Amino acid sequence: PLAQSFQYDENRTISSLGLYFASKGDKQSNVVIQIRGMGDQGYPNKTIYAETVMNADDIKVSNNASAETRVYFDDPMMAEGGKEYAIVIITENSDYTMWVGTRTKPKIDKPNEVISGNPYLQGVLFSSSNASTWTPHQNSDLKFGIYTSKFNETATIEFEPI
Amino acid sequence: HIWGRLISAPFTEERTIYQGQASETLNVNPYNIPNPLAQSFQYDENRTISSLGLYFASKGDKQSNVVIQIRGMGDQGYPNKTIYAETVMNAD
Amino acid sequence: PYLQGVLFSSSNASTWTPHQNSDLKFGIYTSKFNETATIEFEPI
Numbered sequence: 001p002l003a004q005s006f007q008y009d010e011n012r013t014i015s016s017l018g019l020y021f022a023s024k025g026d027k028q029s030n031v032v033i034q035i036r037g038m039g040d041q042g043y044p045n046k047t048i049y050a051e052t053v054m055n056a057d058d059i060k061v062s063n064n065a066s067a068e069t070r071v072y073f074d075d076p077m078m079a080e081g082g083k084e085y086a087i088v089i090i091t092e093n094s095d096y097t098m099w100v101g102t103r104t105k106p107k108i109d110k111p112n113e114v115i116s117g118n119p120y121l122q123g124v125l126f127s128s129s130n131a132s133t134w135t136p137h138q139n140s141d142l143k144f145g146i147y148t149s150k151f152n153e154t155a156t157i158e159f160e161p162i
Numbered sequence: 163h164i165w166g167r168l169i170s171a172p173f174t175e176e177r178t179i180y181q182g183q184a185s186e187t188l189n190v191n192p193y194n195i196p197n198p199l200a201q202s203f204q205y206d207e208n209r210t211i212s213s214l215g216l217y218f219a220s221k222g223d224k225q226s227n228v229v230i231q232i233r234g235m236g237d238q239g240y241p242n243k244t245i246y247a248e249t250v251m252n253a254d
Numbered sequence: 255p256y257l258q259g260v261l262f263s264s265s266n267a268s269t270w271t272p273h274q275n276s277d278l279k280f281g282i283y284t285s286k287f288n289e290t291a292t293i294e295f296e297p298i
Contacts, residue, residue: 041240042268172291181256184279193265200262215281
C-alpha cells in the first residue's frame with residue numbers, strides 16, 4: 001500500500017480526490033481508497049476518516065499520466081486547519097501501478113526537463129508492506145489533486161420526461 | 163547610554179555531552195536543493211541545559227539566518243511537534 | 255559516534271528519516287547557578 005500526506009492552512013471541506021493510475025488489473029479487481037490521520041510523529045495512524053471502493057472500470061489509466069480518475073466519498077471529509085492528513089491506497093491485487101514524481105528525474109512527457117525541487121514540499125510519499133509500518137520517500141510524491149467544495153443556496157434535480 | 167560587563171556570572175557551564183568525531187558534510191535541507199536535520203539526546207538525571215554547541219561547514223549570505231529548536235521525543239523514538247526552545251541565529 | 259542518539263533528516267520537519275550510523279558533531283552545556291551575580295558599568 002502507498003500513501004501521501006497533505007495539510008491545509010484553514011478549515012476546508014474536501015469533497016473529492018484526484019489520482020493518476022499507470023495501469024490496472026482485470027475487470028473484477030478493485031482498489032480501496034482511504035483517508036487516514038497523521039500522528040504526532042509525522043506518520044499515518046490507524047484512524048480512518050473516509051473509505052470508498054473503486055472498481056476496475058472506474059479506474060482510468062494512461063501511458064502519459066493524462067487520465068484522471070476522480071474518487072468520491074459518501075460523507076465529506078472535513079479537514080481542520082493545521083492538521084496533517086494522509087491519503088491511503090490499498091489493494092490486494094499485484095497488478096496496480098501509479099505515477100509518482102521524483103526529484104532530479106526527467107518528466108514523462110518532457111524528458112528534456114527534470115524535476116528540480118521537491119514535487120510537493122509539504123507532503124511525503126509512503127510505502128508499506130502491511131499498511132501499518134510506513135517507509136517514507138522524502139524525494140518523491142504522488143501525482144494527485146485534492147478538490148474542496150463550497151455549498152450554495154439551493155439544489156435542483158430534473159427527471160427525464162416519463 | 164553606557165555599556166556594562168557581567169563580572170560575577172550567575173552560573174558556570176560545563177560540557178557534559180560532546181560528540182567530536184566528524185567525517186562528512188550533510189546539507190541541512192538535502193531533499194530540496196535545486197538540481198531540516200535533527201539529533202536526539204538524553205540525560206540520566208535532571209539537568210539545566212544552558213547552551214548548545216554546533217559546527218557548520220559553510221553558511222549563506224549576510225541576510226540568511228538559521229532557526230535552532232529543541233523539540234521533544236515521542237514514545238516511538240521520533241521527534242514530535244512540541245517545541246520547548248527556539249532562537250534565530252544570524253549569518254554573522 | 256554517539257550511541258544514545260540518532261541523526262535525522264526531513265523534507266518538511268514532520269516525517270523524519272533516521273540515519274542510524276551517523277550523528278552530528280555537537281556539544282551540550284549544562285549550568286549550575288551560584289549565590290549572587292554582579293554587573294559593572296563603564297565609568298561616567
